[PDB]
Amino acid sequence: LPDSVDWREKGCVTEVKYQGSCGACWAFSAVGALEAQLKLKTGKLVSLSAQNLVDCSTEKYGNKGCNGGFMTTAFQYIIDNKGIDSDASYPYKAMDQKCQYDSKYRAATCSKYTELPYGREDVLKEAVANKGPVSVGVDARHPSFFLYRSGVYYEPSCTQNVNHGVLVVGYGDLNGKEYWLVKNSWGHNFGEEGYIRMARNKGNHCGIASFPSYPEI
Ligand SMILES: *CC(=O)[C@H](C/C=C/C)n1cc([C@@](C)(NC(=O)c2ccccc2)C(C)C)nn1
Protein backbone atom coordinates (compact mmCIF):
# COMPACT_ATOMS: atom_id res chain seq x y z
CA LEU A 1 0.00 0.00 0.00
CA PRO A 2 1.17 3.58 -0.48
CA ASP A 3 2.68 5.09 2.69
CA SER A 4 0.53 8.17 2.22
CA VAL A 5 -2.78 8.82 0.50
CA ASP A 6 -4.74 12.01 -0.07
CA TRP A 7 -7.82 11.78 -2.28
CA ARG A 8 -7.98 15.56 -2.61
CA GLU A 9 -4.97 15.26 -4.92
CA LYS A 10 -7.11 13.08 -7.21
CA GLY A 11 -9.91 15.65 -7.31
CA CYS A 12 -12.25 13.25 -5.47
CA VAL A 13 -13.14 15.44 -2.51
CA THR A 14 -15.59 18.32 -2.68
CA GLU A 15 -15.49 21.57 -0.71
CA VAL A 16 -15.88 21.32 3.05
CA LYS A 17 -19.50 21.79 4.07
CA TYR A 18 -21.03 23.50 7.05
CA GLN A 19 -23.72 21.48 8.82
CA GLY A 20 -24.74 24.34 11.16
CA SER A 21 -27.47 23.70 13.72
CA CYS A 22 -28.59 20.41 12.23
CA GLY A 23 -27.10 17.11 13.42
CA ALA A 24 -26.41 15.96 9.85
CA CYS A 25 -22.77 14.93 10.09
CA TRP A 26 -23.85 11.41 9.12
CA ALA A 27 -25.38 12.75 5.91
CA PHE A 28 -22.27 14.73 5.03
CA SER A 29 -20.10 11.73 5.79
CA ALA A 30 -22.23 9.51 3.50
CA VAL A 31 -22.41 11.96 0.59
CA GLY A 32 -18.69 12.68 0.79
CA ALA A 33 -17.85 9.00 0.41
CA LEU A 34 -20.18 8.69 -2.60
CA GLU A 35 -18.88 11.93 -4.10
CA ALA A 36 -15.43 10.32 -4.43
CA GLN A 37 -16.94 7.22 -6.06
CA LEU A 38 -18.93 9.39 -8.48
CA LYS A 39 -15.70 11.19 -9.49
CA LEU A 40 -13.88 7.88 -9.96
CA LYS A 41 -16.70 6.54 -12.16
CA THR A 42 -17.69 9.61 -14.21
CA GLY A 43 -14.69 11.94 -13.94
CA LYS A 44 -16.96 14.67 -12.56
CA LEU A 45 -16.76 16.07 -9.02
CA VAL A 46 -20.29 16.97 -7.87
CA SER A 47 -21.45 17.79 -4.32
CA LEU A 48 -24.31 15.45 -3.44
CA SER A 49 -27.35 16.30 -1.38
CA ALA A 50 -26.97 15.84 2.34
CA GLN A 51 -30.45 17.36 2.62
CA ASN A 52 -31.87 14.57 0.48
CA LEU A 53 -30.58 12.12 3.11
CA VAL A 54 -31.81 14.21 6.08
CA ASP A 55 -35.34 14.47 4.60
CA CYS A 56 -35.68 11.06 2.95
CA SER A 57 -33.42 8.54 4.64
CA THR A 58 -35.60 8.61 7.73
CA GLU A 59 -37.43 6.19 10.04
CA LYS A 60 -37.26 3.22 7.68
CA TYR A 61 -33.45 3.53 7.89
CA GLY A 62 -33.32 4.08 11.65
CA ASN A 63 -32.42 7.71 11.02
CA LYS A 64 -33.72 10.88 12.67
CA GLY A 65 -32.72 13.67 10.28
CA CYS A 66 -31.20 16.58 12.16
CA ASN A 67 -31.20 14.41 15.28
CA GLY A 68 -28.76 11.89 13.81
CA GLY A 69 -28.47 8.89 11.52
CA PHE A 70 -26.20 6.24 10.03
CA MET A 71 -23.92 6.45 7.01
CA THR A 72 -24.57 2.77 6.29
CA THR A 73 -28.36 3.12 6.19
CA ALA A 74 -28.02 6.38 4.23
CA PHE A 75 -26.23 4.31 1.57
CA GLN A 76 -29.02 1.75 1.81
CA TYR A 77 -31.54 4.53 1.12
CA ILE A 78 -29.58 5.63 -1.95
CA ILE A 79 -29.63 1.99 -3.17
CA ASP A 80 -33.31 1.48 -2.35
CA ASN A 81 -34.27 4.86 -3.81
CA LYS A 82 -32.18 4.20 -6.92
CA GLY A 83 -30.54 7.59 -6.49
CA ILE A 84 -29.53 10.73 -4.71
CA ASP A 85 -29.87 14.29 -6.00
CA SER A 86 -27.13 16.83 -6.41
CA ASP A 87 -26.59 19.35 -3.64
CA ALA A 88 -27.24 22.10 -6.21
CA SER A 89 -30.66 20.63 -7.04
CA TYR A 90 -31.59 19.75 -3.45
CA PRO A 91 -29.69 22.27 -1.33
CA TYR A 92 -28.82 22.02 2.34
CA LYS A 93 -30.97 24.00 4.77
CA ALA A 94 -29.89 22.55 8.14
CA MET A 95 -33.43 21.54 9.07
CA ASP A 96 -35.79 18.61 8.71
CA GLN A 97 -38.00 18.93 5.64
CA LYS A 98 -40.48 16.84 3.72
CA CYS A 99 -38.75 14.45 1.34
CA GLN A 100 -38.39 16.25 -1.98
CA TYR A 101 -36.31 13.75 -3.95
CA ASP A 102 -36.68 14.16 -7.71
CA SER A 103 -35.06 11.56 -10.01
CA LYS A 104 -34.75 14.23 -12.72
CA TYR A 105 -31.91 15.73 -10.65
CA ARG A 106 -30.30 12.43 -9.73
CA ALA A 107 -26.53 12.95 -9.60
CA ALA A 108 -25.40 9.61 -8.19
CA THR A 109 -26.49 6.05 -7.58
CA CYS A 110 -25.26 3.39 -5.16
CA SER A 111 -25.22 -0.35 -5.89
CA LYS A 112 -23.78 -1.51 -2.57
CA TYR A 113 -21.77 -0.56 0.48
CA THR A 114 -19.09 -2.33 2.43
CA GLU A 115 -18.69 -2.22 6.17
CA LEU A 116 -15.21 -2.68 7.55
CA PRO A 117 -14.35 -4.74 10.62
CA TYR A 118 -14.36 -2.97 13.99
CA GLY A 119 -11.06 -1.42 15.02
CA ARG A 120 -8.99 -2.73 12.07
CA GLU A 121 -6.90 0.27 11.12
CA ASP A 122 -4.95 -1.97 8.70
CA VAL A 123 -8.14 -2.85 6.85
CA LEU A 124 -9.24 0.79 6.85
CA LYS A 125 -5.84 1.80 5.45
CA GLU A 126 -6.21 -0.75 2.65
CA ALA A 127 -9.73 0.49 1.90
CA VAL A 128 -8.66 4.13 1.79
CA ALA A 129 -5.73 3.22 -0.51
CA ASN A 130 -7.62 0.87 -2.81
CA LYS A 131 -11.29 1.89 -2.77
CA GLY A 132 -11.63 5.53 -1.80
CA PRO A 133 -12.65 7.78 1.08
CA VAL A 134 -14.31 5.84 3.90
CA SER A 135 -17.19 7.16 6.00
CA VAL A 136 -16.31 6.74 9.67
CA GLY A 137 -17.61 7.56 13.11
CA VAL A 138 -15.41 9.11 15.73
CA ASP A 139 -15.57 10.26 19.30
CA ALA A 140 -15.62 14.03 18.93
CA ARG A 141 -17.04 14.69 22.44
CA HIS A 142 -13.94 16.31 23.86
CA PRO A 143 -13.25 20.03 23.69
CA SER A 144 -9.81 19.30 22.21
CA PHE A 145 -11.55 18.12 19.02
CA PHE A 146 -13.55 21.34 18.56
CA LEU A 147 -10.46 23.31 19.57
CA TYR A 148 -8.18 21.43 17.16
CA ARG A 149 -6.28 23.76 14.83
CA SER A 150 -3.34 21.78 13.44
CA GLY A 151 -1.03 18.79 13.78
CA VAL A 152 -1.79 15.15 14.51
CA TYR A 153 -4.67 15.01 16.97
CA TYR A 154 -4.19 12.68 19.93
CA GLU A 155 -6.56 12.94 22.89
CA PRO A 156 -5.87 10.51 25.73
CA SER A 157 -9.48 10.86 27.00
CA CYS A 158 -10.91 9.66 23.66
CA THR A 159 -13.05 6.55 23.60
CA GLN A 160 -13.85 4.16 20.74
CA ASN A 161 -17.55 5.04 20.98
CA VAL A 162 -18.69 6.93 17.93
CA ASN A 163 -20.77 10.10 18.16
CA HIS A 164 -19.70 12.08 15.12
CA GLY A 165 -19.67 11.09 11.42
CA VAL A 166 -16.75 12.21 9.27
CA LEU A 167 -14.85 11.07 6.17
CA VAL A 168 -11.37 9.59 5.95
CA VAL A 169 -9.91 10.97 2.71
CA GLY A 170 -6.32 9.85 3.24
CA TYR A 171 -3.57 8.96 5.64
CA GLY A 172 0.08 9.78 6.13
CA ASP A 173 2.59 10.68 8.78
CA LEU A 174 4.91 13.33 10.17
CA ASN A 175 8.24 11.58 10.81
CA GLY A 176 6.50 8.53 12.23
CA LYS A 177 3.52 10.28 13.79
CA GLU A 178 0.94 8.47 11.66
CA TYR A 179 -2.43 9.99 10.95
CA TRP A 180 -5.76 9.70 9.22
CA LEU A 181 -6.76 12.63 7.08
CA VAL A 182 -10.34 13.43 8.07
CA LYS A 183 -12.80 15.73 6.33
CA ASN A 184 -15.24 17.31 8.81
CA SER A 185 -18.54 19.11 8.13
CA TRP A 186 -18.06 22.17 10.37
CA GLY A 187 -16.90 24.43 7.54
CA HIS A 188 -13.46 25.41 6.40
CA ASN A 189 -12.69 27.41 9.58
CA PHE A 190 -12.49 24.24 11.63
CA GLY A 191 -9.02 22.71 11.97
CA GLU A 192 -6.82 22.65 8.87
CA GLU A 193 -9.18 24.16 6.30
CA GLY A 194 -12.01 21.92 7.54
CA TYR A 195 -9.84 18.84 8.07
CA ILE A 196 -8.40 17.13 11.08
CA ARG A 197 -5.45 14.76 11.09
CA MET A 198 -6.14 12.10 13.71
CA ALA A 199 -3.72 9.67 15.31
CA ARG A 200 -3.39 6.47 13.31
CA ASN A 201 -2.30 3.10 14.70
CA LYS A 202 -2.76 4.19 18.29
CA GLY A 203 -5.35 1.64 19.37
CA ASN A 204 -8.36 2.66 17.30
CA HIS A 205 -7.97 6.18 18.58
CA CYS A 206 -11.27 8.07 19.04
CA GLY A 207 -12.95 5.08 17.40
CA ILE A 208 -11.69 6.00 13.95
CA ALA A 209 -12.11 2.36 12.85
CA SER A 210 -15.18 1.56 15.01
CA PHE A 211 -17.75 2.20 12.29
CA PRO A 212 -16.29 2.39 8.78
CA SER A 213 -18.03 1.99 5.44
CA TYR A 214 -17.72 3.00 1.82
CA PRO A 215 -20.27 2.89 -0.99
CA GLU A 216 -19.90 1.92 -4.63
CA ILE A 217 -21.75 3.60 -7.51
C1 LIG B 1 -22.36 14.79 14.41
C2 LIG B 1 -23.82 14.96 14.28
O3 LIG B 1 -24.26 15.89 13.61
C4 LIG B 1 -24.59 14.16 15.05
C5 LIG B 1 -25.13 14.54 16.41
C6 LIG B 1 -24.64 15.84 17.01
C7 LIG B 1 -24.93 16.05 18.30
C8 LIG B 1 -24.50 17.30 19.01
N9 LIG B 1 -24.73 12.86 14.69
C10 LIG B 1 -24.08 11.77 15.40
C11 LIG B 1 -24.61 10.75 14.49
C12 LIG B 1 -24.31 9.30 14.68
C13 LIG B 1 -23.45 9.05 15.93
N14 LIG B 1 -25.63 8.64 14.79
C15 LIG B 1 -26.51 8.83 15.78
O16 LIG B 1 -26.24 9.58 16.71
C17 LIG B 1 -27.94 8.45 15.54
C18 LIG B 1 -28.87 9.02 16.18
C19 LIG B 1 -30.16 8.66 15.95
C20 LIG B 1 -30.43 7.76 15.10
C21 LIG B 1 -29.47 7.20 14.49
C22 LIG B 1 -28.26 7.54 14.71
C23 LIG B 1 -23.55 8.78 13.45
C24 LIG B 1 -23.41 7.27 13.57
C25 LIG B 1 -22.16 9.42 13.27
N26 LIG B 1 -25.42 11.09 13.47
N27 LIG B 1 -25.50 12.48 13.59
Q: Is the CB of 39 under 6 A from ligand 1?
A: no
Q: Active-site residues: which are they? A: 25, 164, 184
Class at the top of the CATH hierarchy for domain 1-217: alpha beta
Alpha-carbon torsion, ordered 121, 64, 194, 6, to 10 deg: 40
Q: Whose CA is nearest to atom 8 of ligand 1?
A: 23
Q: Is the CB of 24 under 6 A from ligand 1?
A: yes
Q: Name the burial class of residue 211, with classes exposed (0-12), middle (13-18) and buried (19+) by CB atoms within 10 angstroms of its CB.
A: buried
Q: DSSP 3-state assignment of 190?
A: coil
- Rounded Cα distance between 168 and 12, Å, is 12
Q: Is the CB of 23 under 6 A from ligand 1?
A: yes
Distances from the Cα of 90 to the Cαs of 36, 73, 99, 106, 189, in angstroms? Answer: 19, 19, 10, 10, 24
Q: Is the CB of 167 under 6 A from ligand 1?
A: no
User: Cβ(154)–Cβ(202) under 8 Å?
Assistant: yes
Alpha helices (H) in the chain, listed in sequence order = 25-42, 50-56, 71-81, 121-130, 143-146
Distances from the Cα of 2 to the Cαs of 94, 97, 123, in angstroms? Answer: 37, 43, 13
- Chain centre distance of CA 179: 16
Q: Whose CA is nearest to atom 7 of ligand 1?
A: 23
Which phi and psi angles does 100 have, rounded to 5°? -125, 30
Determine the angle formed by the axes of helices 25-42 and 71-81, rounding to 10 degrees: 50
